[PDB]
Amino acid sequence: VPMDTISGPWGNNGGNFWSFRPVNKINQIVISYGGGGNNPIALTFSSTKADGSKDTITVGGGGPDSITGTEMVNIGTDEYLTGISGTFGIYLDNNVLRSITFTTNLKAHGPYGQKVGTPFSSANVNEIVGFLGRSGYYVDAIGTYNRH
Amino acid sequence: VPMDTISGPWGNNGGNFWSFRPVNKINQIVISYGGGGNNPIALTFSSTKDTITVGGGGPDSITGTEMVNIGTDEYLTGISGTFGIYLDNNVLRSITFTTNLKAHGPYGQKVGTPFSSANEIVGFLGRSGYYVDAIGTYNRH
Numbered sequence: 001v002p003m004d005t006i007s008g009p010w011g012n013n014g015g016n017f018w019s020f021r022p023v024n025k026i027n028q029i030v031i032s033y034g035g036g037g038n039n040p041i042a043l044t045f046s047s048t049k050a051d052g053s054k055d056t057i058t059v060g061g062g063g064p065d066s067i068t069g070t071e072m073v074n075i076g077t078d079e080y081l082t083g084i085s086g087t088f089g090i091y092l093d094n095n096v097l098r099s100i101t102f103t104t105n106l107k108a109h110g111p112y113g114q115k116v117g118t119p120f121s122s123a124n125v126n127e128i129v130g131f132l133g134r135s136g137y138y139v140d141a142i143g144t145y146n147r148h
Numbered sequence: 149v150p151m152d153t154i155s156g157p158w159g160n161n162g163g164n165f166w167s168f169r170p171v172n173k174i175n176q177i178v179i180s181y182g183g184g185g186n187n188p189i190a191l192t193f194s195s196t197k198d199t200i201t202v203g204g205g206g207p208d209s210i211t212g213t214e215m216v217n218i219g220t221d222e223y224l225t226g227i228s229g230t231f232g233i234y235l236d237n238n239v240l241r242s243i244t245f246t247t248n249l250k251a252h253g254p255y256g257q258k259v260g261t262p263f264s265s266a267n268e269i270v271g272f273l274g275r276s277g278y279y280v281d282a283i284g285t286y287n288r289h
């Protein structure tokens with residue numbers, strides 16, 4: 001049984017594995033921030049079905065950390081995710097996701113968070129049809145599922 | 149400059165180092181529990197005022213406490229207990245505080261790997277975060 005090509009994951013081995021590849025396009029992403037600054041702590045990916053129901057996952061933000069702010073990625077009708085990039089660095093003695101950018105066929109959304117630490121970038125070829133990685137209190141790792 | 153004899157510590161490398169050796173006798177120990185059960189999450193050592201609390205660094209709410217009251221002619225002499233897994237953490241599961249008079253405990257659930265010290269206990273040290281990762285004693289004969 002064939003399975004979608006994984007790019008990455010990028011990051012480290014903390015937290016718990018997570019995966020989300022819905023059968024319908026991911027049209028909305030919420031970046032949750034903590035600590036009063038631009039510190040990403042959680043990601044929500046959602047895909048709205050024709051009937052009004054949503055496929056959704058939230059990863060990271062597994063702790064008591066108060067959500068202090070959110071940013072959103074809105075993916076339009078003739079828009080689709082093509083690439084991701086960002087940085088992994090230290091947030092409160094944790095090597096985690098520090099910034100993230102979501103590229104579509106139409107624009108780059110972001111940067112979301114703080115451009116600090118070790119950078120990573122997906123291969124510029126392609127459609128991103130899902131995400132996977134590791135998370136706990138924050139986002140420990142992230143990669144993509146891909147289909148050309 | 150001499151320093152008091154350390155026994156142990158026992159446990160693992162989790163959490164942060166802690167240490168408490170007061171010049172006044174430790175007369176009370178509070179054992180804090182979490183998750184509605186017999187699961188120790190924090191230890192408070194207090195002197196006749198010197199005090200420390202170790203563990204309980206999480207949002208985990210305290211669901212109960214128990215107390216050792218050390219008598220005026222009583223003093224700590226040994227410790228023992230177990231370490232094991234509590235919510236994906238290899239931490240302290242039970243502890244017994246022995247004095248010249250009696251063993252106090254056990255406090256918690258006697259599950260996991262046992263330990264026991266080989267005297268007066270004059271303080272404690274260890275590692276802690278959300279729970280108690282390690283524990284040992286300062287000693288003076």
Ligand SMILES: CO[C@H]1O[C@H](CO[C@H]2O[C@H](CO)[C@@H](O)[C@H](O)[C@@H]2O[C@@H]2O[C@H](CO)[C@@H](O)[C@H](O)[C@H]2NC(C)=O)[C@@H](O[C@@H]2O[C@H](CO)[C@@H](O)[C@H](O)[C@H]2NC(C)=O)[C@H](O[C@H]2O[C@H](CO)[C@@H](O)[C@H](O)[C@@H]2O[C@@H]2O[C@H](CO)[C@@H](O)[C@H](O)[C@H]2NC(C)=O)[C@@H]1O
Nearest residue numbers: 014015062093135136137138162163205236276277278279
């Ligand atoms: C529920 O408590 C656990 O998770 C705490 C947060 O760490 C999680 O999130 C990060 C980032 O996403 C991730 O990398 C971790 O793996 C962990 O996720 C958990 O992963 C395990 C599998 O590994 C999985 O089973 C769990 O489901 C998953 N949790 C969730 C909610 O999904 C963690 O506290 C963090 O621990 C790391 C070191 O592992 C540390 O760097 C972080 O600074 C610290 N976070 C915070 C907010 O303090 C919990 O562990 C605590 O307490 C334990 C018990 O006493 C200790 O053994 C741990 O070491 C840690 O204490 C911290 O220790 C570091 C030094 O090691 C010290 O700098 C901190 O001060 C101290 N914390 C305190 C309060 O003193 C526990 O794993």
